[model samples]
Target chain A: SRLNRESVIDAALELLNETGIDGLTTRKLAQKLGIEQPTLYWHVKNKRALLDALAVEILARHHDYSLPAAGESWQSFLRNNAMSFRRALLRYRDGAKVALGTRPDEKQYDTVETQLRFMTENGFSLRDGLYAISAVSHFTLGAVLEQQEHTAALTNLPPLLREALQIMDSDDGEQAFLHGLESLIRGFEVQLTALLQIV
Target chain B: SRLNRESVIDAALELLNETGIDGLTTRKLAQKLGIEQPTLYWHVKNKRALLDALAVEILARHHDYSLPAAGESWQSFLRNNAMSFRRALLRYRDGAKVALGTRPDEKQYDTVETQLRFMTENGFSLRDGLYAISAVSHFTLGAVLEQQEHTAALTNLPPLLREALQIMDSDDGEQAFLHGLESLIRGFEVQLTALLQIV
Candidate 1:
């Protein structure tokens, strides 16, 4: 039987959902794949390499809106890209954790270049454009990281904290996230407007 | 030597800087403390328990601005709180990672209650205040998480990305974070103003 890189990544992702990042090991992965340690090593050299592959693969599999649409506003593109990134990070257990420590794959270079170009075309200086993109990326990753790892206690709370917890409960944090997202977008709009006045 | 919980946690934090979250284990921690496994377990229980304590302790020791000053504005408080949180998370190796998966300590309740009250007095509804606090927190955590774990490649061939990379290199992401933080705060201000108009 032959093993391919893609299939190995797919199986590892499946294992990740079951065992989490801390619990994930090459030994477990090899066992799950019904292959020996050396055989699995042939595909992924170690846990670090496997994690790197999984991080990139998760984005490739689940991140749908990595770019702007035809004639999309920069603001719209940022919002859509953020929301999509959040969803992708939420797709697996510890998905955001995996992403936090990995580097961008070379395959992502073209996509990132295009995204930056779109921002420039829509009136963002390269530095400002990078800041905006990085902020959105950071905010989304932070949001997903909390959601994935959080399971807070609700008992013996203050009245204000209790009420706040209820609001989050009604939607599992979707509304709160939307509000924050809007705030981020509006803030970026303000900056863009300010930049225009300077020009 | 008898093991006290505080001394154990202190030693563990020292170990954390040396070993990171992943490498800091009960066995090594016990060895460093000059105690056997059973003696260590009696004090700290296990890795999960140790991690929880470390997470809370990191903030307690390093997080200086957990509350507002006298007559401080809500906006000022949020920014200060966020900056403090980011600093606290940056103080140790994998500090943000330690924070990502832990619950808030009971000692934090009074602080959170007062912070929420401040927001309420400043014209924010309970829900709105929670959202504002949460967004700042989430954004800061995201920022620190990326900073702690990030080491991007700079040799890429794209002119725009190379330029973008240079901007980040100038101050190790401080300027970009300030920009993003300002944008978020301004966005929240916008929302508060809109709410005021509706009332």
Candidate 2:
């Protein structure tokens, strides 16, 4: 069977959906791909490498909006980028978990620099721009991390807690996420405004 | 050995430090506890159960500002609460991952309700309040999850990306986190102010 980095990762993602992150194994992947174990190793040295590749690929395939559009406001760019990142992480079983500690592929370097440049041009210092970007990135990661792994129970509780649980559980949680996403973007805007002494 | 749920959990935490989450095992925990495997089973049934207990206990032991004080503003409360929670999750190796997907024990019901009540009294709808609380929670979780799992390298990066990497790596990352936390709180304030226009 012909195998390369991309093909191996595509099968790995399918295996992830079937078995989750824990159950995913190189042995199992090779079996699924109609290739031998050694052949699989040629593409990805080990599980972590395979996962690293998968993590980057997930974003490549699903996360769009990485850079600011021409003349896009920094707030709009951060919001859309975060929403896109969250969707990418939610696209698979344990998708957020898969992304947990992984670094961006070097291919993302230019895109990240472009993002930072967008903020700097809009009056954010490089440090503040990175901080804002990291906050959005981390918040999106945490939001998806929770949403992907857990969504849960009520029926026995105080009225307030019960009502809150009902709301969180009844929906796919997009509303709260969207609200929080806006809050984060607006919070960054507030900082930008303060820095510029703008009304 | 005098074995109890608390003692067993204490020993498990020690074991966690000795070996990260993946290396943690019932067999190893039992060995460390000086108890037999069968006796260990008497307290927590499996690794997942053990982790669930650990997640809750970490918060109980370390998370200090759960409820607001008399006359504490909601903004102050959320900010302090988020900071405290971040510290607790950072207390152990892989602590954030340990806390991930774990539910609050039944004992936490009243405390959670009280927090929610504080938001309602401060003019947040139950839904908005939950979203605010959760955004803080998820953002903190995501922040810690990344910090705990990764902190990395540059050398060959582009000019702007290189500078950004240096900033993130030079500090222990508390500065960015604090700034992000403030931005989140400020964003919520923006929403709260709009809600109370008093026109």
lDDT of 1 at A1: 35
For candidate 1, write residues A1-199 as lDDT tens digits.
Answer: 3479888888889999998888899999989999899988878887878878888999899999998988888888898898888888888888988898455578888988898888888888988888888888888788888777774211078888778767766776667788899898889889988864851
Task: Name the regions of candidate 1 deviating beyond 4 angstroms.
Answer: A151-155, A196-199, B151-156, B196-199
Interface RMSD of each: 2.0, 2.0
lDDT of every model, 2 decimals: 0.83, 0.84
**TM-score (C-alpha, index-matched) for candidate 2:** 0.94
- Cα lDDT of model 2 by residue, B1-199, tens digit: 5578788889889889778677789999989988889988888788888888898999999999999999999999998999999999998888887887666578888899999999999999898899999999988999998887773111068789889878877987689999999889888888988975741
DockQ top scorer: 2
Candidate 2 lDDT at B172 equals 74
Question: lDDT by residue for model 2 over A50-72, one digit each (tens)?
Answer: 77788889999999988788888
Give the DockQ (C-alpha) for candidate 1.
0.62
